[PDB]
Write a protein that binds this ligand. Structure first.
Ligand SMILES: [Zn+2]
Length: 7
């Protein structure tokens, strides 16, 4: 799957 990190 795809991953996104929003710090
Ligand atoms: Zn993946």
């Amino acid at each position: 799957g795809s991953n996104q990190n929003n710090f």
